[PDB]
Every structure is written in structure tokens, then in C-alpha cells.
């Protein structure tokens, strides 16, 4: 047993990290077949921020300008276009170590692993969730840009995140691998706030189903509640509303522990009402929204 936040093994991705430099800016980049992806924001300096035009700044750039390091070695740039917030840079070589893979846009609620790099080499890997307010809680220092997010499904790597910037709140913002940002954010330096966030109610519920399956059981109660009665409370405490699709998903978890979802919700309703009078649920003293029902399945049984 046991239950820890777990990140996919970073191996297959490690071999896709490269370093990119353009003037007084160095950030990481991702190298798939003969392509290298990274945040367009590389090609700016720190007066360009305020108000950069990217189409403009890019039309005065040569492949001469782009220094690509894969370890000691270096790669020539050939083509180079732009996808929303990302440069697609053609290079003289397809990556020996390019794996099977796709580009999916994850949805708020789903989770992914993050491989955090500096200067085109990785230094750390951690699991986190794609927040409902569209940002994420990462550990990211300057030079972190280019670092990617991702899942694994059998053998194929589902790519879903590339890190671009940190916000005034200390949270981070970035984009899928098509260049389209997650959330209402843009490459400029402007007045920009993380809109107030909420809690991933689907998740906390997957998380309680862990506790139970692991053997912890004190939070439950004889009651039930309608769905509509549950939400009324869930709103007050700043949680997402639970919908029927949610309730479907929890299907197999109620089927494994034999606990009706709407019962679980009664328990959660009760948990919100009362707190824990100080006590542990599966280690924590707070309610843990960063586990998918799906991750409680991979990891429990």
C-alpha cells in the first residue's frame, strides 16, 4: 500500500531536451524528429517586453541567431516558423531518441508530470495539476522556461505543457504544444493576475476513495444527499460543482470499495461542515484535490 504523488518516469523525455540561445537569452527547448519547439519569448530582450510584436521581431532573425546545444554538440537551424506562442525550428537532424508520442490539450482537472530544466539539461521532476483557474503550482526558477509537462499511455508520450512565465502570485503559466496558451494569458509584460481559483471536487473524491481503499475509513457517515443539495454547500466552500459525468467517473471506485458516490458526497459535505477536529486523512490534514480518479486507479490496484 501507501499513497504518494507520483510522476511518470522522465526517461523518454530527458532525451528530447536541448538548450536554446538567441542573444542575451537562454532557455530550454524540446526536440522531436527534425524539429525543436520552444517559447517564442526567447527572441526578446528586456525592453521588448512591455510591448513586443513577435511577427516583427522574428522577421529580423536569422538561423545564424539561434544557437542550439544538445550536450556539448550543437545543431544547425534550417527552417523556422511560428505557431502562436512557439517557434518551430527545423534542424539538420532528427533526434535518435525521439519516441512514440502525441500532442494533447489537457483540461482543467487532469494532472501531468513536469521535467524542470535549466540550460538544456534536466534537474528535477514533479507531478502537479492543471488548475481550474488555468495556471499551475510549479517550482520554477529563471531559465526554467522551455520545461515540459506530459503523461505516458503505455508507450506513447502525451505532450500537454510547455512553461513560459511565472505570475505575480508565484504560480506559472504556459501553453500546449500547438502554442495555444492555457488560460487568458499572453507573452507581454502587462498587469496580469491569476483569477481566483477553486478546488477540483472530482479529485478530492477520488482522493477519499484512496484513503478508504488503503484502509483509512473515519470520514464516512450513514447519510446521503441529492446532487443539488451537495453543490449548494460545495459552492460556499469554493469547490467546483459536481456534475453527473463526474459521478459516472467515480463509478468503478464506488464499485471497488462498495461506497455510493452520493454517500461519499455526504461524507465530504460533512467534512466541509466540520473540518477534521485535527486529524489525518491518508497523511494530510487538508483535503487533497491533485489526484485524478484515474491516478488513484493506476496507483491503487
Amino acid at each position: 500500500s501507501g499513497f504518494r504523488k507520483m510522476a511518470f518516469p522522465s526517461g523518454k523525455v530527458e532525451g528530447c531536451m536541448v538548450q536554446v540561445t538567441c542573444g542575451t537569452t537562454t532557455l530550454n527547448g524540446l526536440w522531436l524528429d527534425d524539429t525543436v519547439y520552444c517559447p517564442r519569448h526567447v527572441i526578446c530582450t528586456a525592453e521588448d517586453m512591455l510591448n513586443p510584436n513577435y511577427e516583427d521581431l522574428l522577421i529580423r532573425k536569422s538561423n545564424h541567431s539561434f544557437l542550439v546545444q544538445a550536450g556539448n554538440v550543437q545543431l544547425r537551424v534550417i527552417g523556422h516558423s511560428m505557431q502562436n506562442c512557439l517557434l518551430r525550428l527545423k534542424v539538420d537532424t532528427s533526434n535518435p531518441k525521439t519516441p512514440k508520442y502525441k500532442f494533447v490539450r489537457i483540461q482543467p482537472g487532469q494532472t501531468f508530470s513536469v521535467l524542470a530544466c535549466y540550460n538544456g539539461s534536466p534537474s528535477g521532476v514533479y507531478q502537479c495539476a492543471m488548475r481550474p483557474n488555468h495556471t499551475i503550482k510549479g517550482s520554477f526558477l529563471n531559465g526554467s522556461c522551455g520545461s515540459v509537462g506530459f503523461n505516458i499511455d503505455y508507450d506513447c508520450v502525451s505532450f500537454c505543457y510547455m512553461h513560459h512565465m511565472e505570475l505575480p502570485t508565484g504560480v506559472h503559466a504556459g501553453t500546449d504544444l500547438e502554442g495555444k496558451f492555457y488560460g487568458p494569458f499572453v507573452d507581454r509584460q502587462t498587469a496580469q493576475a491569476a483569477g481566483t481559483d477553486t478546488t477540483i471536487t472530482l479529485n478530492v473524491l477520488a482522493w477519499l476513495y484512496a484513503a478508504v481503499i488503503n484502509g483509512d475509513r473515519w470520514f464516512l457517515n450513514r447519510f446521503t444527499t441529492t446532487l443539488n443539495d451537495f453543490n449548494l454547500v460545495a459552492m460556499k466552500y469554493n469547490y467546483e460543482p459536481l456534475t453527473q459525468d463526474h459521478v459516472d467517473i467515480l463509478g468503478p471506485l464506488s464499485a471497488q470499495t462498495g461506497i455510493a458516490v452520493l454517500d461519499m458526497c455526504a461524507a465530504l459535505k460533512e467534512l466541509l461542515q466540520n473540518g477534521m477536529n485535527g486529524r489525518t486523512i491518508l497523511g494530510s490534514t487538508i483535503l487533497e484535490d491533485e489526484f485524478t480518479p484515474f491516478d488513484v486507479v493506476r496507483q491503487c490496484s
Binding site: 519569448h41 526578446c44 517586453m49 520554477f140 526558477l141 529563471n142 531559465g143 526554467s144 522556461c145 512553461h163 513560459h164 512565465m165 511565472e166 505570475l167 505575480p168 506559472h172 507573452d187 509584460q189 502587462t190 498587469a191 496580469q192
Partner: peptide
């Protein structure tokens, strides 16, 4: 305000 990283 912000931090392009």
C-alpha cells in the same frame, strides 16, 4: 508584475 522566465 509578471516574470517572462
Amino acid at each position: 508584475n509578471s516574470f517572462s522566465q
